């Protein structure tokens, strides 16, 4: 719903995997509550 239909969105190429990863991160950090990406991965480095 927030997606903006702009020529740059329509034209510019991005990596699909990066987009999958962004989609997963914005949910995992919403769950954890942390907004820092690097702090989150640091907590991700020890968790099982």
């Amino acid at each position: 719903a927030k997606l903006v239909l702009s020529q740059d969105n329509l034209d510019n190429e991005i990596s699909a995997l990066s987009l999958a990863n962004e989609q997963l991160e914005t949910a995992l950090m919403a769950q954890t509550g942390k907004t820092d990406k690097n702090k989150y991965y640091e907590t991700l480095a020890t968790s099982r």
């Binding site: 020529q7 740059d8 034209d11 510019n12 690097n38």
Partner: protein
């Protein structure tokens, strides 16, 4: 008044705008700075958790209406003092009034120059303008000198127009150009280390 910054309203189009600024002294107090409107109302965007830096070119997109712009409208920026901040910081503001159908000549003259230059130097008119370096004190002679130097450093060394521009004393551009990766990002954050 003494020295604060320069503020500019960059009209993208209908109900789309931009604010560029470079606050001079950026060392006192700054936490989630603010954007003021009509000098007393409408905190427009309070979302940046960063501090603006000295002599640094920033750009924040903002949505306004041309109606209020038709009359004198003082838009301001408030570097937010930590807990309280309404005007008691070192506040800065500026007005922007629009009135169409005026002053056609001086822009068309610069267009005459840039179109002659594009046609002659063979590069496209968008390239010749993006590769033109403009400063508030930049004389036209030094501007053309920078352009011709760029063409020369592109002839010898056989480099890109962007590399030639960087050789012609051009800053790093944070803004994504031509629907591509910005220079700053393809330089440092491609891919961001760690």
């Amino acid at each position: 008044e003494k020295q604060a910054d320069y503020i500019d309203l960059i009209p993208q189009g209908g109900n789309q705008f931009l604010v560029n600024f470079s606050v001079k002294k950026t060392k006192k107090d700054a936490t989630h700075f603010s954007i003021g409107y009509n000098k007393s109302f409408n905190n427009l965007a309070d979302k940046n958790g960063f501090v603006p830096l000295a002599g640094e070119h920033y750009s924040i997109p903002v949505t306004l209406d041309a109606k209020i712009l038709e009359k004198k409208t003082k838009i301001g920026i408030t570097r937010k003092k930590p807990e309280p901040a309404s005007d008691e910081n070192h506040y800065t503001s500026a007005t922007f009034t629009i009135h169409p159908n005026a002053e056609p000549g001086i822009w068309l003259l610069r267009l005459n120059k840039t179109l002659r230059l594009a046609k002659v130097s063979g590069m496209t008119p968008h390239e010749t303008q993006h590769a033109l370096i403009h400063v508030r004190n930049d004389s036209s002679e030094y501007e053309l000198r920078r352009f011709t130097e760029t063409l020369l450093y592109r002839k010898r060394y056989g480099i890109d127009t962007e590399t030639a521009l960087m050789l012609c004393n051009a800053g790093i551009s944070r803004i994504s150009y031509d629907g591509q990766l910005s220079h700053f990002d393809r330089l440092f954050n491609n891919p961001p280390l760690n």
